[PDB]
Design a binder for these strands. Structure first.
Ligand SMILES: [Zn+2]
Lengths: 122, 50, 51, 88
RNA sequence: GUUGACCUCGGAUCAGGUAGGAGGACCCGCUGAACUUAAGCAUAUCAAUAAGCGGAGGAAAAGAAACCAACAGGGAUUGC
RNA sequence: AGAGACCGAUAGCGCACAAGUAGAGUGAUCGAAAGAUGAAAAGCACUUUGAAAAGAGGGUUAAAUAGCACGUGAAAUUGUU
RNA sequence: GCGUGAGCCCGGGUCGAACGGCCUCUAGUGCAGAUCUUGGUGGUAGUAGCAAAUACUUCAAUGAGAACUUGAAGGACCGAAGUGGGGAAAGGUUCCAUGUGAACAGCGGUUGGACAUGGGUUAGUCGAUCCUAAGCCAUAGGGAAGUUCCGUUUCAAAGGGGCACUCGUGCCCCGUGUGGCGAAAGGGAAGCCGGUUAAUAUUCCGGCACCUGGAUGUGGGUUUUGCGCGGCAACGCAACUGAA
RNA sequence: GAAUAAUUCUCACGCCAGGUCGUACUCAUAACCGCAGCAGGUCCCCAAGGUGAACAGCCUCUGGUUGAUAGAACAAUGUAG
RNA sequence: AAACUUUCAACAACGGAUCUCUUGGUUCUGGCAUCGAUGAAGAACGCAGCGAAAUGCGAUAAGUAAUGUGAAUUGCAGAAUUCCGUGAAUCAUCGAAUCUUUGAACGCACAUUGCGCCCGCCGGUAUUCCGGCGGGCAUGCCUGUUCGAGCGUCAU
């Protein structure tokens, strides 16, 4: 056969995915055995096989990864790898909600004496 | 010596792999300039530091 | 050796009685596996494309 | 016997491979590296020679992680996928 | 006697967190020379600099007078 | 990212090239040399002498007074007339 | 050909892509020297020389080519504190087979520890892994502006052993404590013979053994005087309860 | 902890398993260090016959070499005997 | 008279100056602020149909997914597509993943691929032994939780 197309792999579930994953390894192992002592057009298949397995692996992982992200939402604590990663320094600034709080005396003055919109004639 | 360590064994394996002449097509590629290997080693010429 | 023995059984459904190993000067491991006397080798090698 | 005769008595090694810099500068008896200062927490570095400083500074290696931050900053450290993507 | 509080000092692979390293052109501190000039040389000069050590940011530091003045008085800090 | 009354392969950064590489020291460290065929490889089929390296004919090209020791090819120094 | 001169202009040959005259502006602006810097080349010169460790010779074969290739036959040396047979440190593919232009083997070279293409190192019993020695470094603490210096049982609340559930949870005893690294020549559980490959073997093949750890059965032994008998004795035998 | 069996017998026989790394070759008038295929230097194990007091010197067996640029002539001055 | 030494010319040699070129340096000006225990900089070992180095990547290993473009790559071989849609490329962009052994480096150590402990699953009669697989075990400090020590101390 040939390379497995990435288009159909998305509309599956884990059971066929693992069967396809399991079978693909089998031919790759055996087909390699032919490589010793004989060179032919079958060598091209070796590259195609390896590359196909990669696609199926990412699909299984991506499908699994999305599922538990939904599960851990609406929760206070979640795993370290699913938390957003920006920057060590960027994760420790004060939040905008707290970096914008003010005191009552400061608020009292600004409610009654804010900046105005004036103009001066010449 | 016949007594070695895995690290010394491992270093010797790599230093043996990178000592052979250049393959043949490389000098037949378009716009190529490599002529002869510039990092050849020989056990009776120059010891690298392990 | 434990991993090699188990792996052979799951791949080729063959059983061994003794396994020896060494590390070649290039950095790969070579393993000698001897088979139970009730099974012959040649046919299995031919069946599994050995030789 | 000050010279040539006494060079044939050398068959011992004072230095070995270092685990942190791969350089053969680990003193065997002291067990401290004469170039990276291992096992000290911080790496040896001195200002009375800047040639030795340039030989090991950022950008002389693979840069497996730092060399991808410029792109991420320009794009604003976002997340998610384009609306028309597939694979959920 | 029993029971229930308080104060100080501890254990725990208890729940949740945080610092080390890199870089150091520019910045904030500590420590700290000699060559050289004086036609010699010791105070002096090179210099409150080079080397060493600690600590941060895109700028850092300073800052709303226990100020300057002696005028008909000016009015946080920074830079030319 | 944009520029110069800057340098033009012994110059300009130590590095225009598989350069902090090859190499030296037990070590801290020290640290180079090396750019240019032709528009296009069209990188010399075939015959002949030779054990072979190669030579002589014969070819490609505007030019082989451009033949992978390749643009132009001075002086010191050498051979023949 | 011109100019007293630094210099300028033309004729002939080679070569292949840019370059001059005049007035102003500008500078990393003119070489024989510095035991100057880098690169290249001469006379000396086919000269000095290739002289320690006793030494070679005949026939045949391969080959374009043989003193230093191979086989046979002579003549010699090392003379068991060896020019023999194996190892520790160090070396790192130098080991074996097949082939080979140039370069290297201070003469030659069909030969090579050189060049090209492939192959080769099997362990419960040999070592490392375990224990400490001289010595090095964490912990409790105290110095120092600081990188860090001392400190190794010290002015420390420092551990480890047993059992049962329905089951993880629960129970019961002993305590001054007392951490790691450091030997291929120190201490230390256990394998011998015969054969085999171009290249490994106390490992591979055949035979005959041994040590440690873990679960279990048969034979035998002991007991109704509940945990054996004999010898005067030194002691004997196939066994013959033993926690803190 | 037994009287129809019980047994915590260090006796005999019988069951299962034993993980990881090194193992080629030289150890030196050519495989180590001295710029090199350098008369230098570098730790050990086994040790035949004869003369002789003897691991002295001299000759031989097992085993190993026949490798150090060659041909011709025999002046001076040399080095060694 | 030849030979030898010397001078000049033509041609042929050794060597790489001069002329022209340049994906390279140097200086000035302008815009921006982004490393790390969610494991940085650096180091080691690996990965290609035929690769040693450089460049790129990490057992999903000369790369995977997703978006954009729209017919290649090229030293050889081999295939892939072909235009319906089911899409070449060492292409450009990049919002999802993988990421061996190490390194501040974190079970104890390391001149050793050395030696430990806890929990769960799978085999061998097995809670205690052996093998395989997965998840864990550093130090300083803060807030809270729980269990404790003291005639320091309060009331029966
Ligand atoms: Zn180091």
């Amino acid at each position: 056969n040939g390379k497995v197309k990435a288009g159909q792999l998305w509309s599956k579930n884990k059971e066929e995915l693992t069967k396809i994953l399991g079978e693909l390894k089998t031919e790759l192992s055996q087909l390699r055995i032919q490589k010793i002592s004989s060179s032919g057009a079958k060598l091209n298949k070796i590259h195609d096989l390896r590359k196909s397995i990669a696609r199926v692996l990412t699909v299984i992982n991506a499908k699994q990864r999305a599922q538990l992200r939904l599960f851990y939402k609406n929760k206070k604590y979640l795993p370290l790898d699913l938390r957003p990663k920006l920057t060590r320094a960027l994760r420790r600034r004060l939040s905008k909600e707290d970096a914008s709080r003010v005191l009552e005396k400061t608020k009292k003055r600004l409610t009654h004496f804010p900046q105005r919109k004036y103009a001066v004639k010449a | 010596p016949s007594h070695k360590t895995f690290r010394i064994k491992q270093k010797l394996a790599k230093a043996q792999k990178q000592n052979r002449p250049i393959p043949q097509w490389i000098r037949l590629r378009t716009g190529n300039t490599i002529r002869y290997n510039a990092k050849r080693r020989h056990w009776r010429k120059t010891r690298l530091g392990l | 050796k434990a991993q090699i023995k188990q792996a052979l059984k799951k791949l080729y459904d063959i059983d061994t009685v003794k396994i020896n190993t060494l590390i070649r000067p290039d950095g790969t491991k070579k393993a000698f596996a001897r088979l139970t006397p009730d099974v012959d080798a040649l046919d299995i090698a031919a069946t599994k494309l050995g030789l | 016997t000050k010279g040539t005769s006494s060079f044939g008595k050398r068959h011992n090694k004072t230095h070995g491979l270092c685990r942190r810099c791969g350089r053969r500068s680990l003193h065997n008896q002291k067990k401290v590296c004469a170039s990276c200062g291992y096992p000290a927490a911080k790496t040896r570095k001195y200002n009375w020679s800047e040639k030795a400083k340039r030989r090991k500074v950022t950008g002389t290696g693979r840069m497996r992680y730092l060399s991808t931050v410029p792109r991420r900053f320009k794009n604003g450290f976002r997340t998610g996928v384009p609306k028309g993507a597939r694979g959920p």
